[PDB]
Structure formats: structure tokens, C-alpha cells
Design a protein around this ligand. Structure first.
Ligand SMILES: O[C@H]1[C@@H](O)[C@@H](O)[C@@H](O)[C@@H](O)[C@H]1O
Ligand SMILES: O[C@H]1[C@@H](O)[C@@H](O)[C@@H](O)[C@@H](O)[C@H]1O
Length: 497
């Protein structure tokens, strides 16, 4: 029973200009966290997003999401003048945010080139030089994507798709301004996050980052390093990621993400992963990795297959990779997302390296006392993270409302065994958060929607649903001291303060 933190993607922060940003409201959430006894702030992947707006399908495994840039500081410097397009409240309007914030950032870039001090123009220069190894490909990637009507890289003219030496240099020369712009967006993002990170550290708060084990097909790194992935000559994946048919899905899941050529990454001492983790550790203190099981083995699906039925398991060099990580960083600040159908082999790898696993209370009541998500079954070392629900789950109140008769009843009886009782429906989220903090899990993390006991409309992501995801936002003044105080109380009572 060491500590607890809260889960809130930066986009959910309240504030003007269409979305949560790395500014004052963000710093405000830090104070809230501090005064609430919280010691962790978990977020979703922070890279640039494409269609669907999912943080797990980023245009780059290294880049930073421009949408998170707080335009206010840039306004205070005279680089740009802002006028609101009519953004709504409590939700992100991505369509509108795209049409507005990009030109907004572009305009602010012109202000910078004409009013930036030497120390500013110099810093921007150092940044471009130091992050060049990935920044160069990223900036050109985005630029070329705009220049081609948003077409995916493997749909661009042969010369550019195959990254021919000449074509690249020419494009890189006749679009140096757009390329500089994108680099500018990155410069702001990392500098703004950096400030926020130091802030959190001074308050004694650690950041729990996130990253999908597999990258997106249409992204800077796949374009610039196709040797690391199973692609044909046209740049199209010959096999895609996914999971096999299980008790639930009768056809399994076909994600479409490109699969790694593990043999190639190994011959290079897993350079990609080390670089990927090094860059994440610049932003986070702990890094959760989605679909951890992939390091043990992954389900390879023929690209020509419409479902996941035709796949097969393929072992991945997990042991070697983590051994390498251990030596590279002298530690392994990884957080294993081991939800779903896991095997003894996956647990073996996870445990063998002392990596903490996950526990989701919303999944603990559809069976009997042997459910590994029920608190009494948590490993004695308590090296695990308990959640009421994650971003992919409905809010706890929303889950409760639709849960089966068995789950609802078992929930009550189980809570009772722990001296926890509830009357009102809106009380459920707190009963579970309480159960979480009372457990052996050294760390408990809760999404803010549960702290506010919001219903299903505040659900961050609904797997399978083709819209309305990643949009939920706290409304101004919605979260209040009242909530922080109640959390502090619960944390003190369980010894997590
Ligand atoms: O490392 C320490 C230790 O575990 C303490 O018993 C307590 O839990 C602290 O908060 C921290 O976690
Ligand atoms: O007020 C805002 C923010 O909420 C924090 O208080 C930060 O430290 C600054 O004061 C900022 O201007």
C-alpha cells in the first residue's frame, strides 16, 4: 500500500482554445494532485495523431502532439493574435481543432521568425540539431503528407516513398519553411512539457507515460526505416498485428499495425527500442507499454486476411531485449500492460524482470473468488497497479449500470467482505476506488471520470466504436477541492499518503 495517482490525458484538461494544453490548467492539476495526496499522473501516448485521433496510432514514435501546445504563451510574446472559432466545452472537437489550431500555430511561427529574441532563435537552433536524428524525418514526413493531400506515405510518388537521395533533398529544399514549422511545433511541445515535468518533480509527482508496442503503418519511422518492419517493395505490410479468436471475439482482432523484423532489431542491439525508451524517459518517470505480451510472442496475421483467424504465433526476443534495456538504463522503468488472455510464458517474462503488471477491478466480478482481478488474489509482493477502469473501459459508473445481474450482486457481496457498502449508484466509483486503495497493490491509479462519478458519456475510448473517442474533457470548475480532500482522506486511511 505505497501510493496512488490519477489518470487524465492532457487533452482532457479544461481551458480555452479547444483542448487541454501544457499550461496553467495543467499546472493546476498538479497542485490538485499534490494536495490530494496523489503522487502520480498517468497520461496516454503524447505523439501527433491522425484520422480517428487515437494516441495509439501516432504519425511518429518520437514526435510530440502539436495539439497539446499552449498557444497563450505565444500570444503573450506577440507572435500571434487569437480569435476563437466557437469551440465547445467538455469535449474536444477534433475536426474544428484541426482546421483552426494548425493555421494558428503556423501564424505564430511567422511571428516567431520576426520577433523571436536571439536566445529564443538560438534555443530553437540547438533543439533542431540535437533532435535531428528523428526530427529530420518527422518534419519532412508531415510536410510531405500535407503536400500530398494527407495520403499515407506508402501512397506517395515512388521517388519519395522509397526515400531516394535526390527527391528527398529537393523536397527538403523547396519546403524548408514548412519543415521548419513542424520542427517549431516540436520545439514548443518538448520545451513546454519539460517545464511541466520539472514542476511535477518539485511537487514530488511522477509521470506515468504510455506507448503502443507496435507503431502505426503511416508514420515517419516506418517510412524512414522499412528494414525494421515486414513490408513488401511497395511499402505495404505483408503481415499485420492482432490477436487470435478467443472466448469473446469469434474472429479475433486484426489491428493492421506493421510488425517488427525482430531479427533486424536484434542485430542492431535493439537500437530502435532503446532510442524509443530513452526519448520516453525524457518525458516520463515510468513507461507503460500497451500489449506487453507482444514481447513474448505476437499473433502474425497475413495482410491478405480480413480477420485474425488465419494468423499464427511467433516468438519475440523478449529476454534479450529486456536484458539490453537493463544495461542501457541500469534499470527497467517499464509498466507491463498484461490484461487480456495472458499465458504462463508472458507472466514468466514479466516477473523474471521485476516488471509491475496491471489489475482492473471492472473485470473482477464476472466469475468467482478465483478471478485474478479480485484484490485478495493479487501477488504478495504487491508489485502491481490496480485501476477501477482504464481509458478503454467505460467509466466505473457506466460499467456498473450495464453490468450483469451477477456482477452487480457479486460486487456488493465482495465489497461487503471488505467492510465497504454503498446505497446510491453514483457511489459505486468510490466504493471501488476505496477497495483499490485498500488492496496489496503498491500503486492504484484512477481515471478522473470516476473521481467525478461520471456516466458512460465521459468514456475516454470505446474499442470498436468508429467515433467520439478521445474527446472527453473536464469542464471549467468541474473538479473541485471537495474531491481532492475526499481522496486525501481515502489515501490517508489506507496508508498511501
Ligand atoms: O518505497 C516506500 C515504501 O514502500 C514505504 O513503505 C511507502 O510505501 C512509501 O510510500 C514508498 O513506497
Ligand atoms: O496560475 C497558473 C497555474 O494554475 C499555476 O498556478 C502556475 O504556477 C502559474 O501561476 C499559472 O499562471
Amino acid at each position: 500500500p505505497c501510493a496512488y495517482g490519477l489518470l487524465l490525458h492532457p487533452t482532457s484538461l479544461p481551458g480555452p482554445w479547444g483542448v487541454g494544453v501544457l499550461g496553467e490548467e495543467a499546472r493546476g492539476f498538479l497542485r490538485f494532485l499534490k494536495e490530494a495526496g496523489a503522487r502520480y499522473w498517468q497520461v496516454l501516448p503524447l505523439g501527433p495523431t491522425g484520422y480517428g485521433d487515437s494516441p495509439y496510432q501516432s504519425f511518429s514514435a518520437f514526435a510530440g502532439n502539436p495539439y497539446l501546445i499552449d498557444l497563450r504563451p505565444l500570444v503573450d510574446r506577440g507572435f500571434v493574435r487569437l480569435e476563437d472559432p466557437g469551440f465547445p466545452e467538455g469535449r474536444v472537437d477534433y475536426g474544428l481543432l484541426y482546421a483552426w489550431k494548425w493555421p494558428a500555430l503556423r501564424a505564430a511561427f511567422q511571428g516567431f521568425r520576426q520577433k523571436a529574441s536571439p536566445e529564443e532563435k538560438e534555443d530553437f537552433a540547438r533543439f533542431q540539431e540535437e533532435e535531428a536524428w528523428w526530427l529530420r524525418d518527422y518534419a519532412l514526413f508531415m510536410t510531405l503528407k500535407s503536400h500530398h493531400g494527407g495520403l499515407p506515405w506508402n501512397a506517395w510518388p515512388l521517388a519519395l516513398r522509397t526515400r531516394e537521395e535526390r527527391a528527398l533533398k529537393e523536397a527538403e529544399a523547396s519546403l524548408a519553411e514548412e519543415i521548419a514549422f513542424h520542427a517549431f511545433t516540436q520545439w514548443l511541445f518538448f520545451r513546454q512539457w519539460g517545464a511541466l515535468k520539472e514542476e511535477a518533480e518539485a511537487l514530488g509527482i511522477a509521470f506515468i507515460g504510455d506507448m503502443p508496442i507496435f507503431v502505426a503503418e503511416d508514420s515517419a519511422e516506418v517510412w524512414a526505416h522499412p528494414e525494421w518492419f515486414h513490408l513488401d517493395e511497395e511499402g505495404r505490410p505483408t503481415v499485420v498485428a492482432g490477436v487470435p479468436p478467443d472466448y469473446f471475439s469469434e474472429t479475433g482482432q486484426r489491428w493492421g499495425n506493421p510488425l517488427y523484423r525482430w531479427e533486424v532489431l536484434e542485430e542492431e542491439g535493439f537500437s530502435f527500442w532503446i532510442a524509443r525508451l530513452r526519448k520516453a524517459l525524457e518525458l516520463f518517470h515510468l513507461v507503460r507499454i500497451d500489449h506487453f505480451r507482444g514481447f513474448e510472442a505476437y499473433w502474425e496475421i497475413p495482410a491478405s486476411c480480413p480477420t485474425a483467424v488465419e494468423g499464427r504465433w511467433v516468438k519475440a526476443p523478449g529476454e534479450k531485449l529486456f536484458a539490453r534495456i537493463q544495461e542501457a538504463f541500469g534499470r527497467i522503468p517499464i509498466l507491463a500492460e498484461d490484461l487480456g488472455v495472458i499465458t504462463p510464458e508472458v507472466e514468466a517474462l514479466r516477473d523474471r524482470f521485476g516488471l509491475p503488471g496491471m489489475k482492473v477491478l471492472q473485470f473482477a466480478f464476472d466469475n468467482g473468488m478465483e478471478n485474478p482481478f479480485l484484490p485478495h488474489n493479487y501477488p504478495e509482493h504487491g508489485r502491481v497497479v490496480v485501476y477501477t477502469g482504464t481509458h478503454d473501459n467505460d467509466t466505473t459508473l457506466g460499467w456498473y449500470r450495464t453490468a450483469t445481474p451477477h456482477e452487480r450482486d457479486f460486487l456488493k457481496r465482495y465489497l461487503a467482505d471488505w467492510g465497504i457498502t454503498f446505497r446510491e449508484e453514483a457511489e459505486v466509483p468510490w466504493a471501488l476506488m476505496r477497495l483499490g486503495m485498500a488492496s496489496r497493490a503498491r500503486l492504484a491509479v484512477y481515471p478522473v471520470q470516476d473521481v467525478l462519478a461520471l456516466g458512460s458519456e465521459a468514456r475516454m475510448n470505446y474499442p470498436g466504436r468508429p467515433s467520439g473517442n478521445w474527446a472527453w474533457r473536464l469542464r471549467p470548475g468541474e473538479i473541485k477541492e471537495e474531491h481532492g480532500e475526499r481522496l486525501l482522506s481515502l489515501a490517508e486511511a489506507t496508508g498511501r499518503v
